[PDB]
Amino acid sequence: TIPHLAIDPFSLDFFDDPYPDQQTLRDAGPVVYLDKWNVYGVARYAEVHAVLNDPTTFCSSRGVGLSDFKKEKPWRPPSLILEADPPAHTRPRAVLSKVLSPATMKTIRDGFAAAADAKVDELLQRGCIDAIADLAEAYPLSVFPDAMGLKQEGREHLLPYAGLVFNAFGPPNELRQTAIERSAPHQAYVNEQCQRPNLAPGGFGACIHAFTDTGEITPDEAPLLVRSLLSAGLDTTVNGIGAAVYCLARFPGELQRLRSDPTLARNAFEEAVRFESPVQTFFRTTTREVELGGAVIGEGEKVLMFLGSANRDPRRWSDPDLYDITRKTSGHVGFGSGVHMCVGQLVARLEGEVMLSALARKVAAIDIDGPVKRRFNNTLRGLESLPVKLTPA
Numbered sequence: 158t159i160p161h162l163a164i165d166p167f168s169l170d171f172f173d174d175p176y177p178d179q180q181t182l183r184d185a186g187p188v189v190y191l192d193k194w195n196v197y198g199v200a201r202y203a204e205v206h207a208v209l210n211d212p213t214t215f216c217s218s219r220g221v222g223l224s225d226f227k228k229e230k231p232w233r234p235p236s237l238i239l240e241a242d243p244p245a246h247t248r249p250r251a252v253l254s255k256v257l258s259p260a261t262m263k264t265i266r267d268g269f270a271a272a273a274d275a276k277v278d279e280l281l282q283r284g285c286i287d288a289i290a291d292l293a294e295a296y297p298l299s300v301f302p303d304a305m306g307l308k309q310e311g312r313e314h315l316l317p318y319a320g321l322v323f324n325a326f327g328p329p330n331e332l333r334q335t336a337i338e339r340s341a342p343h344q345a346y347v348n349e350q351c352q353r354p355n356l357a358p359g360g361f362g363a364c365i366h367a368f369t370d371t372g373e374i375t376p377d378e379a380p381l382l383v384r385s386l387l388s389a390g391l392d393t394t395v396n397g398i399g400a401a402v403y404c405l406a407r408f409p410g411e412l413q414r415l416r417s418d419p420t421l422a423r424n425a426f427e428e429a430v431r432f433e434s435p436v437q438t439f440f441r442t443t444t445r446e447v448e449l450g451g452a453v454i455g456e457g458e459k460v461l462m463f464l465g466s467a468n469r470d471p472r473r474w475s476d477p478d479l480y481d482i483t484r485k486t487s488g489h490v491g492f493g494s495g496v497h498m499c500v501g502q503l504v505a506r507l508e509g510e511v512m513l514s515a516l517a518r519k520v521a522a523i524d525i526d527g528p529v530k531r532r533f534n535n536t537l538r539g540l541e542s543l544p545v546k547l548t549p550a
């Protein structure tokens with residue numbers, strides 16, 4: 158009753174152009190079985206949203222990658238928030254929610270925006286820059302590690318560690334095996350920076366440790382929660398900002414609308430998250446036999462959610478393959494949905510907004526003027542290199 162497909166959603170060919178194979182996954186049926194990896198898959202918005210919003214049935218404590226923590230040892234100690242289910246998930250979630258709260262955004266917004274304007278001003282001085290290394294990577298590196306409270310030493314480990322993390326969610330292919338092979342130095346650095354003495358006062362890290370005397374988390378839970386932000390906090394915004402600039406580079410008409418009304422920056426970034434879905438996929442594990450889109454899934458089965466496919470499902474979106482900065486983007490699943498919905502989405506949106514605001518005010522045109530190179534990762538979608546000429550406004 159369930160169609161079986163041979164598509165490998167973690168193959169290089171798939172990463173290079175996933176959209177045809179994603180329509181094939183959506184249109185084969187509401188629930189497919191991927192013979193390559195022995196997992197169920199849902200690529201339509203409706204089922205992706207349902208799975209995300211049934212955390213009891215589709216749990217996260219058995220891992221949100223392919224590996225089932227009940228069957229294999231996790232490559233690193235489980236995240237106390239991402240790889241936990243309610244109620245164990247609840248209190249750590251609240252702490253991270255207050256650490257990255259609306260009130261917290263007000264303390265960092267001015268510095269984040271000044272750093273965004275400064276970067277655009279710097280890039281305009283060069284003209285022909287790499288929107289990835291010189292913008293999508295350079296900007297978050299100039300604000301987030303400092304907002305964390307990290308020392309300068311060792312920050313080169315941050316992106317390699319994040320790439321390792323997101324590759325580790327995937328199947329045991331060469332991307333994952335190679336990432337884990339090289340992980341030791343990056344794990345050592347990250348784990349060490351998670352300790353209270355190594356986090357500058359007032360930053361996200363020290364604020365997490367400060368919540369250890371409320372009874373929401375104990376002192377021994379703080380390092381792993383700092384680890385969460387060092388895992389999910391940087392490389393995501395890199396690919397989110399990169400996708401936004403990529404969209405504006407490909408859709409000059411939308412850049413011109415953004416210039417005409419820079420208050421659209423925040424929605425232009427949200428639309429970029431939907432349109433590219435930098436975070437492409439996550440797994441759940443069934444805790445019982447479940448009926449999902451006419452299929453009966455047994456207990457202990459991995460289910461692969463195609464977030465990016467769900468964000469382009471024409472059953473849900475009008476003109477899904479068009480970048481539209483005035484689109485009503487509420488409901489897209491690029492930040493997830495439900496109890497695990499991205500707790501750092503205010504940071505992500507802040508960085509995205511202030512950067513697109515800088516571009517909206519300072520840039521008249523963004524033209525690709527060089528080979529576009531894609532970066533391959535089992536979970537992240539984004540570019541390795543995006544040469545562009547920036548024309549001053």
Ligand code: HEM
Pocket residue numbers: 217221238239240250253257385386389390391393394396397398430434435436439464490491492493494496497498499500501502504505
């Ligand atoms: C474009 C930027 C970002 C995107 C697209 C993104 C995407 C996502 C998605 C889809 C989830 C859901 C995971 C799941 O359902 O299993 C998630 C969760 C999470 N995100 Fe983000 N994220 C972004 C930025 C950030 C930032 C900046 C931070 C921290 C500063 C962060 C921290 C987290 C954490 C800790 C979780 C786990 C929350 C939980 O399990 O309750 N993310 N993110």
Ligand SMILES: O=C(O)c1ccc(CCBr)cc1
Pocket residue numbers: 236237238239240322384385386388389393436
């Ligand atoms: O808690 C963590 O370490 C963690 C949380 C979320 C992700 C991916 C969603 Br942006 C990865 C790692």
Ligand SMILES: [Cl-]
Pocket residue numbers: 233343344345347348
């Ligand atoms: Cl680690």
